[PDB]
Symmetry: D2
Subunit: 470 residues, 4 copies
């Protein structure tokens, strides 16, 4: 009668360690894996303990549909404080005048953030233009084939990508300007998932204005860098700025949408000023358009992250991020590796392994087997996305642990050694060998000691640094 | 040189309490606010500590785009174990045969989960039919006006709602079957945000098959009940079942999508069997269609919740949820309140305040001022959505704290006293008064003591019960 | 060198009779077929010789893209007179104040005319409501199935039809009003292909305004009647009126689009009167949106037809059209045939053959074999559009030849005899394939011939407009 | 009583007002020099067919698939027409089919899109200012103007402003990005032959359809004066007037039979254009066919298979050269100096003026032609070129020597234009009193020359 009811009350108060050992262990194993591993995936990073604590707060429970002042349900005086605070810090972090800029912090993640904007400004079967996927774009910028639309962006809207110049490795802004005149985009996307150089926002803006389109920036990857002022801000030229709250920003998984406010343009003769209406449209698209109940526990984490983002320690961190990157870049350069575009203005670099006579697809799996985390990526000029020639390497992940130039140079050597091992297996399994067979020879018995020998040395090195979290 | 670099390392390992007192205090205030208040919002509930500890895990860091064995990035052997485990438990919680059913657990929340399905199955400007918003539907089921499409569902797809019978209060399935033949839906939604009775899924399935459409169930609200077997399962008749992982399920904020697998139909003559292709379509729609990197930390929280959901304590909980609702319902009934449809087969009820001579819009604000959390809602027969007559009251939130029949009856009294105070203020401020003026008189000095008197008594009563997941 | 160049000049000036005997013969055969046949298809009629002469004019050559004074090419002073005249007459025919009403006369036909309006006013994937197809609607009013969108209207625009009350036979305006509040139509269509009663335009207007939609009337089938004032005008309540120039109007194949002009409403507070903008939108949609170079030769025929439509002879014609319809109706009623809705306010009627124990699909083919031209059509309450129960019978065609009440009663008898032959064939034998076969059979051929010859010999007694 | 007379009364009596307008136009066409490429004079045989009782018969559907009965004679007609259509272009009935119901050329194209591309699908065509046609797609930074652009996705390909030739290289490049479903090989104002083989290669590479719009060259291709697009294209749309000298109507030719085969399984995949395209015309877009037009078309198709027509089409091309070089030698700059077809595009910047002004002056002199933007024009509001075609006049009996005398009459108009020039104000000065005698003096001399030739029709 009341024996089991007490057990119920005990259940909701019971610690994870006891309640779910099965899941508890998986988290422990992952925590370990992250610790002994070298993280070089550009989109990776380690959240602060302060942010993680906010995610476990009672803020999960409160359903606060709508916005501060326009709430559907009542009893939100504290959620209002939080959401209002978060967006106040968001504007501060990027030095934005509240009268010139507004921000929406409800987006569940980065992808939903972008889609909300399209839905709001472009509208069904509208025209969008973004960096091609194999050229360093992101799916949310549109992606389709001769057979079908794959990305949601491509499905409901009409996309046609602009490309990078295969020779220089830089974005071909000239061709974009030309195609834009024939396609008449409604919105142009200024952002990249795998691009190692600063975007010419001023140039793009002009191209957008020429065609009467919006300029949306997706600073997902460089959000941390722009905040610290380590890289040129896109806010000066863009109309809308979408961003993820994780990656270089080191927040929890969430998204944000910055939009212009105030005067859009004026009539020379009548003096009648036309004001921006992005605030209304964008907000309406997030709710009640797409999303429902805001994830207040995440908004908190974001708010916490934004405070840390405005500290000097962060500013230093972001500079060290870039500094490390050049160290890693030149270290590999001097080793004979062809960096795409000959260096990086930001945190990441794209290594074209054709320089060593191999591809990223095979190098990826080998590096992984050695606790070296990174991802393959197609290089400018690749005639096949199935066999990518390059590897994407970012520094923000390791930098957060305390890695410095000298260390990233030691990492560079570990990476090379992985490529080496790759070239051995590649030559051993023949030339007409498939990726299927390569994976088998790798996990094979012949190279089992070699892989382990490196892995153990990589792990022992990573173990020397702290792992933010706990 | 190295003085500030050490401070950097200290910052990432620094506790929230020290790192951000400003946010830390807001959380404490909220945590205190939830404690002393009676939560009666149907969609509300309290997550278990175990779940809350999973969200703060290092799982936040790993980017695992794709699905188990189909991952874009490497080093996911532990994320795979987690995602594979979660979805295995998901199928178990609802006693589903893995050969007959599959599930995607990546959706960031409920809404994204629904939109994912439409994208995959219905496709741009396809026809969708759902319960009307003011009749207890949800925005994601579609909503528009004579002037614009408001819901993303309506914006990108061609939607037309089906309505509840204003007299009885039950969904008018007959009109639906009729309009369906005209509209030719490609998919019909069997779900509600504010409905107090069990859906006739069998009926709906027939109507769907007649027009060659899919039947998608949105068990967001009754997900918990269905799991414990307290309410008839929609899995028997529907093709797809979307759900939120919170509310009655008591998980963290996230969504799931269940889809049919195996044989769809067979040719009587040729014997050639056609198989379902929902798995591929739905999965492709979630990724790389709509979402990006899975929120693994939430996927863990869902997994944890799903294990608790399969326990006997949960089963008892859910039974107590419904039991409490009947107690609250009949308690208000006996006080003369008109419950829409005269009761409820589930956790929530819809109280029509026209019975006491007022509206939900005003009662909402008064009850709130007294720490009585609930939301207004239009009743069947309301000629104006600006002045809703009804209140939505749910029991899952309080029942989680430990409330029982007898307690919910006491709550029923406290609520009544709230309606009373509402009636006094309503008559005091006149009849032609606006909601604007009402709010002012409420917060006014004349009723400042009355409100406080009730508030303090409610909070003192609310304090007697525990609150899940603290320090 | 110049021997064949002379032949070329001879070719262009050579008569059809000589230039293309093959085609010349087909025309003669058809002309004959029409002469000896009894035309009872509601959408049919016979154009005046005057109109037919206009179609062969040199107006075929001029390319006059755009509108009067807004032409893309020059040298259109005479085309401008024509088009301007035509639309001037169009407004007169329906007693429409030019300040309150405008009209576009370029549409190649009725369907394009309708689509032109949707593209202009409704816009891609915009809601549209019309009478359901099997209930007497038209394809252009929207039509779809579970499998697919079939009509262009349905493919590009959201369409959801309203239905006729299966019991009474009248349109169910109540259900429309109800579904309208859910669907939120941008444009409602008040027109019918197979409907025997006057539309409650006032009622429909109220429903349209309630949902802030446009009321578009498709008077294709009643354009002639409304012109003569035999039937209540849709112009008093509608925002836009589309119409074909043939059928009851006895013009050549073409379409027109009438639209409201002037003040739409006057805002209460501001007081700034808001004006209609249909003229621009609709015109823009016809060109340069949808169509290209106008078919001035048809625009002439239309103009000619419109002048004839304003004569007393025409007025008497249309009255006689309705008169004949009543006679035909009651003549079949008295023979026991069930007329859907029990009569007709206009030119056509729907005969429910279930009263005789058969279907339209089986009666159509028999009647055809007897030179009796008519078409099958689903009755209200038909559970299968594959086996339609009714026949659609119209008077405008024969009436033009000179047929009168007494004659249409003799026609009624001829029709009944066709139904008998149908029933007798139906009794012996089954799928339609088997039926058609039995009809072409060895024993009913005579009975049929006995009828055909008698029908033809009767039709042969009346003049055939054209030549 | 009197009503029976009315339906049998002649137009001359029934409607004098309309009757006169027709006479005035017939006169105007007789005394004017028609040089609009899209113009032509239909034979008297075709015109008589348009007035036939065929106007009355509603024959919805296709032969053997009709909705209404009593169509045995319409079936013969429509079947004959499409039989002749295939003969005219030497097309094997097993390899090719044709739909002859389209009310005009524009509807013909749209039908194809509706059938193959499917709503919000991607098509590509020559840019409008580069000599494309509206139906091939046309939009701006502000709105979609052409029906094609509205319901579908269009992204045009351009002509090389330097050479004047279509830039196939850039098309091949952009195509890889836009993923067209259908590419359009057709022009309204393009002076050279299309590289269909090339286009086909580009289409196959992207897995698209190759639709040819031979509206302007339909007559030329029929006679074999110009390379046929049927050898490389999947679908061929066309108008039945213009160079074909039929009444206003359209046709749609489509491939039939085997599309491709599987090397291993030997399983052959067959084309399905016939069904889709037909279904799109009806019951998709159109309603009751215009049988009176279908007859005229059939008549024209017979004339198109005669030797007299063949000669005509060659004289058409021949005249064009004579006119091209006659203006070349007078110092005028022809874009792509030389034409492989009936029309040419005269760039008036070589004479220090624009087409927009020359058009209005030439018109005032009974010289019919139209302005058109040249490759390299930075403003479509001030077009630099004039489009001049020979099929119209050639049909009257005009020969090389005559078109040279025409070339002189045209030049004199350009002079008169340059005098007035040294657009609103220009029009006023033209109609002004100062140049009233000069215009009349040339007009009377132009008209007196045209009067010397016969006018097909009556
Ligand atoms: C709550 C709910 C959802 C999901 O809402 P989110 O706040 O986006 O998780 C979906 N459907 C229904 C019927 C609901 O009640
Ligand atoms: C990572 C990323 C996003 C957001 O990804 P989520 O996993 O959905 O948070 C958005 N845009 C770009 C360019 C990105 O690289
Ligand atoms: C006949 C008809 C049309 C037009 O038909 P066409 O054969 O295309 O001229 C349009 N609407 C209605 C209601 C009709 O009956
Ligand atoms: C003229 C033309 C058409 C058809 O024009 P209509 O005015 O509709 O007869 C079609 N395509 C092209 C390329 C043309 O030049
Ligand atoms: Cl990424
Ligand atoms: Cl809700
Ligand atoms: Cl009809
Ligand atoms: Cl043209």
């Amino acid at each position: 009668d009341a024996d089991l009811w007490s057990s119920h009350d005990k259940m909701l108060a019971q610690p994870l360690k006891d309640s779910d050992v099965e899941v508890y262990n998986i988290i422990k194993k992952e925590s370990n894996r992250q610790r002994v591993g070298l993280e070089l995936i550009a989109s990776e990073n380690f959240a602060s303990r302060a942010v993680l604590e906010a995610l476990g707060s009672c803020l999960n429970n409160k359903y606060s549909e709508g916005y501060p002042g326009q709430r559907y349900y009542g009893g939100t005086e504290f959620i209002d404080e939080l959401e209002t605070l978060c967006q106040k810090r968001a504007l501060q972090a990027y030095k934005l005048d509240p009268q010139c800029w507004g921000v929406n912090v409800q987006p569940y993640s980065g992808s939903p953030a972008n889609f909300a904007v399209y839905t709001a400004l472009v509208e069904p079967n509208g025209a969008i233009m973004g960096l091609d996927l194999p050229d360093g774009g992101h799916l949310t910028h549109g992606f389709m084939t001769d057979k079908k639309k794959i990305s949601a962006t491509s499905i409901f809207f009409n996309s046609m990508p602009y490309k990078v110049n295969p020779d220089t490795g830089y974005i071909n802004y000239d061709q974009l300007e030309e195609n834009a005149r024939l396609f008449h985009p409604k919105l142009i996307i200024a952002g990249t998932s795998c691009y190692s150089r600063n975007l010419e926002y001023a140039r793009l803006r002009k191209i957008a204005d020429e065609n009467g389109a919006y300029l949306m920036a997706d600073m997902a990857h460089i959000s941390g860098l722009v905040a610290a002022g380590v890289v040129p801000s896109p806010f000066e030229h863009c109309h809308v700025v979408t961003t993820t709250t994780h990656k270089t920003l080191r927040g929890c998984r969430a998204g944000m949408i910055f939009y212009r406010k105030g005067v859009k343009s004026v009539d020379p003769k009548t003096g009648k000023e036309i004001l921006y209406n992005l605030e209304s449209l964008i907000n309406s698209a997030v709710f009640p358009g797409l999303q429902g109940g805001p994830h207040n526990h995440a908004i908190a984490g974001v708010a916490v992250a934004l405070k840390q983002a405005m500290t000097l320690e962060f500013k230093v961190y972001q500079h060290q991020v870039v500094a490390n990157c050049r160290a890693l870049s030149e270290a590999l350069t001097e080793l004979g590796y062809k960096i795409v575009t000959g260096g990086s203005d930001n945190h990441l670099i794209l290594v074209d392994l054709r320089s060593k006579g191999t591809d990223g697809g095979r190098a990826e799996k080998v590096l992984e087997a050695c606790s070296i985390a990174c991802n393959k990526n197609t290089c400018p000029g690749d005639r096949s996305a199935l066999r990518p020639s390059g590897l994407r390497l970012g520094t923000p992940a390791l930098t957060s642990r305390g890695l410095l130039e000298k260390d990233f140079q030691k990492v560079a050597h570990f990476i090379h050694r992985g490529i080496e091992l790759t070239l051995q297996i590649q030559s051993d399994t023949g030339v007409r060998a498939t990726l299927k067979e390569f994976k088998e020879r790798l996990a094979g018995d012949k190279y089992q000691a070699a892989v382990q020998a490196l892995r153990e040395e990589v792990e022992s090195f990573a173990s020397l640094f702290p792992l933010p979290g706990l």
